[PDB]
């Protein structure tokens, strides 16, 4: 039995930690909602 609990407001934080790259990937999406890489 699943339940929900509030965790916060949805707001943009000024000067938040900035990280992660921006990869451009060729992908396929199947009928089960799973993404896979196309090579």
């Amino acid at each position: 039995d699943m339940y929900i609990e509030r965790a916060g407001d949805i707001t943009w934080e000024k000067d938040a930690e900035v990280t992660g790259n921006s990869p451009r990937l060729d992908v396929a999406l199947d009928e089960s909602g799973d993404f896979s890489l196309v090579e």
């Binding site: 929900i4 707001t11 943009w12 900035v18 993404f35």
Partner: protein, 156 residues
């Protein structure tokens, strides 16, 4: 139940202790999460019940109490923020420039940030604070790292 707008953890007591299986967004009286988090099951909010209203396995999305309300889209140029809500940890904003998923049916924004599976459903926001999609359905690339699509529904 609590119906105030915001980000919420999705928990279960079926396993050992209380386990966080995902996250979602309450907006305009509707709870939004990824299908793989709930598998379309009903949810509890205090003494109240939330019943599924719309869902689709291929999009990996589900809404409760009403139709999908989130319609903001990534502009294709700007940095965004993942409001990550990791299991047992405080909500935290992470800024990033999305990459792209190129598909036969069009391009989708993607965020190359790696969090535990129980973070699925955390919202990705634009600079106006609008939810442009949910984090948690993606791929594992040739370095073991994780890249999630920016998954957004359609507002009828």
């Amino acid at each position: 139940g609590e119906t105030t707008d915001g980000v919420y953890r999705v928990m279960t007591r079926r396993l050992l202790g209380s386990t966080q299986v995902g996250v979602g967004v309450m907006q305009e009286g509707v709870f939004h999460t990824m299908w793989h988090v709930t598998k379309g099951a009903a949810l509890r909010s205090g003494e109240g019940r939330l019943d599924p209203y719309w869902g689709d396995v291929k999009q990996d999305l589900v809404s409760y109490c009403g139709p999908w309300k989130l319609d903001a889209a990534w502009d294709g140029l700007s940095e965004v923020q993942l409001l990550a809500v990791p299991p047992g940890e405080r909500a935290k904003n992470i800024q990033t420039l999305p990459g792209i998923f190129k598909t036969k049916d069009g391009d989708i924004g993607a965020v190359a940030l790696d969090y535990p599976a129980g973070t699925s459903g955390s919202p990705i926001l634009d600079k106006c604070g609008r939810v442009i999609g949910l984090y948690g359905n993606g791929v594992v690339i040739k370095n073991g790292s994780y890249v999630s699509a920016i998954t957004q529904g359609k507002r009828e």
